[PDB]
Amino acid sequence: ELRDQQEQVKEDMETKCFICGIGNDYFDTVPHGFETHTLQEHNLANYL
Amino acid sequence: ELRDQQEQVKEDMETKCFICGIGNDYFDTVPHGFETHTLQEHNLANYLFFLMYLINKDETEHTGQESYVWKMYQERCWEFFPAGDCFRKQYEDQLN
Amino acid sequence: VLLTNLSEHMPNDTRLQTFLELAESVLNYFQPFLGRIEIMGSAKRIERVYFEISESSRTQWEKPQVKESKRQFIFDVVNEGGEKEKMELFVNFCEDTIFEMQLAAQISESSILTVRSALFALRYNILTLMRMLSLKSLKKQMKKVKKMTVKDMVTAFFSSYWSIFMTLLHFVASVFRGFFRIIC
Amino acid sequence: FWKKIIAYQQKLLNYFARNFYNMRMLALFVAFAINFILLFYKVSTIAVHYVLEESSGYMEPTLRILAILHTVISFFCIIGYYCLKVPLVIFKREKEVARKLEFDGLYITEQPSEDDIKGQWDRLVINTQSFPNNYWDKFVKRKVMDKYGEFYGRDRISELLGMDKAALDFSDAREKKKPKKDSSLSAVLNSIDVKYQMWKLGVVFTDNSFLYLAWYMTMSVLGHYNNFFFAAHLLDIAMGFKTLRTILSSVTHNGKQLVLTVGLLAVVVYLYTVVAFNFFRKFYNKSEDGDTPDMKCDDMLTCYMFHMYVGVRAGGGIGDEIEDPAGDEYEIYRIIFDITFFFFVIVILLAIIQGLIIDAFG
Amino acid sequence: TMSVLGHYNNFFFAAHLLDIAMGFKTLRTILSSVTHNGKQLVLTVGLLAVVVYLYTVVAFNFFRKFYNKSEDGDTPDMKCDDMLTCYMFHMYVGVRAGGGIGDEIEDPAGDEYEIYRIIFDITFFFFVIVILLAIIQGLIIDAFG
Ligand SMILES: Nc1ncnc2c1ncn2[C@@H]1O[C@H](COP(=O)(O)OP(=O)(O)OP(=O)(O)O)[C@@H](O)[C@H]1O
Ligand SMILES: Nc1ncnc2c1ncn2[C@@H]1O[C@H](COP(=O)(O)OP(=O)(O)OP(=O)(O)O)[C@@H](O)[C@H]1O
Ligand SMILES: [Zn+2]
């Protein structure tokens, strides 16, 4: 259960954006869209 | 965990293309589209053979595309690799 | 390469199709040696590049150890490899695999007894079974069959199947005897 | 005569084919009955003879009747198999032979590996005149001839397939009439296809399920010479009940892994045997009276036997069995030896066995 | 009825402690871990009885001089002369023993059937003690999962 919870957290972060909640594919329609969005547009560190 | 990792790798390969990253359903809109795309259009073995071809082939004899890829490879700038797009997506309306 | 380029750039052109029926033979010969990849060209456009795949390179890639290396690389780049560096790891793998392929191509330069025993046992044991049928003595056996009997019919059926099982046991015994003989 | 004997034979065929399975764990019911009677079996008294105890007083004739009934039901199960399940096996084999003869030309373009038992044995059925007897496609010989006629030679193809070259054209032409009647027993014997029956029997003999049922026959028959052979028929529950099949698949799913783990355990214990045979030999005495000692590690084969028989089975390990090391120059060395034995063999490897079974379940 | 009979004998009130399974739903998860695969557990116990009975047949036929259990050698207590007794012995002492039946039965050193009996004991240990009990644990763990 602990390992599955770790996997759940990891895949949640890799599939959805933490703030907006949009899937990774929509951003990935533009190359590198997901990490660009989650590191520049919707960075939780930036919100903090 | 080892068995789940094996399953993860297998289903990743069966659902997405290794290079482009597009799901299998979009290709499967045309029959046998996924395996056709992953064995002809976006074959990783084909990319490896192309790198071998550029390395062995002389620089002066390079065509325009070959020179482009050679320069971007020598500067280690991986954008000739298609990400999020394919020939099918680019010519969706035009080709079919 | 010219014909393939034209064919892929026109999905629907009857004339070019007709030239394709004129030229399967060359195309079928050159199918193993024609490579096809898609790249993002300088025009912000995805283009297909056709190149030469050599026979030696194909064989070296189809060597089993290279496939084990491919499986290991995929396992790694899927499980611990990240999205950002995936296609840097892929190029590193391609470079190393190309080097090992070139080295291998450079260096590479210029049961039945058991099966035979099983066939012999089957042939002999089933021929022994066929000898009884080929005896032409069923006419003599018609002595008690001409006097029709349900018991006679049942006994004949059961005896035939029992003789089949007898033959199977003889086959197994002959197989074991041939086994002990053939190792010895 | 010929009109009715075959009909009654087919009646028997149909009855056995219908009743095959019922006659199959009827056999299991009889097997549990015989084995329940066998629990009342006592040794009493040179030759020692076994006497079946019976409070009722007639258990011996009942056991004999049950043994005869079992050896009859097993034979009826053999017949039921050969009536019901073997036509499907032959239909399979024929469809694969036809579809490798056509699409791969397994006997025209290329040749069998000579390491394939069925690949070599099927060479006979090509030339039979009763081919696709079970398979629906009756045109496979002509399809292969159309596919390979021009290149490999029509004469070669027809001689391989048994097609009558000089006679097919004549059959198209004027046909001669011959008096033939089913009432002629010699004509029936000429009509039967000897080679096709030979090939069929070979396939049946190579069949796995038929061999299992033949073993079931032989065990039941030998049970009359010795009654305890009927206990081996209790092994049939694995196939009789599919409920037990899940539990047994939990083991057999990782069977190769289990076998390799047992081999690795033998290698590790052999390494420990090497270490003990070299340095720890004065600790393996097993005698009770000190006058004559029974040294279990003076000969290394005996030492290895000891390590895999008593050491592995012991809960604590080899140290629970071997002597105590207190007050000896190699005390700490032997403590490390024993602790590593316990942790690697008893704890980890058996944990690997349990992990394999649990992972198979999951 | 149990509560009423508890007046005639006070110990019948101990059976009411079985009510915790339904009283507490916290225990219900632990008990469902067992009862979820109850049919599988029952079939595994039956299969264990069949396997041990096969071993009993083998021992009753070939290994009978090794099942003496007496302390003084004047009168021996032979536990496998009658096969019902031998089966009782195999499922009572043999299965419960950690090493298997060999930890209980006599030692085979210096006998014509030494290797045969070693194979017998090792197979008993590996099939019964190791695998089947591992099947029980695996069923419980799989039920949890
Ligand atoms: N709103 C978001 N902010 C940051 N990352 C996000 C967001 N939504 C999705 N992600 C994804 O979650 C991933 C994990 O981010 P994070 O940096 O917290 O992970 P980490 O590996 O624990 O940390 P780090 O590598 O910075 O030490 C990111 O790489 C990104 O792809
Ligand atoms: N870019 C890609 N290149 C190759 N295969 C891909 C790609 N994207 C997805 N796949 C899928 O991954 C599957 C696995 O390919 P691969 O040939 O490496 O697997 P394998 O079974 O290990 O190898 P093989 O059968 O060739 O020995 C392919 O059949 C295909 O469906
Ligand atoms: Zn977002």
Ligand SMILES: [Zn+2]
């Ligand atoms: Zn792709």
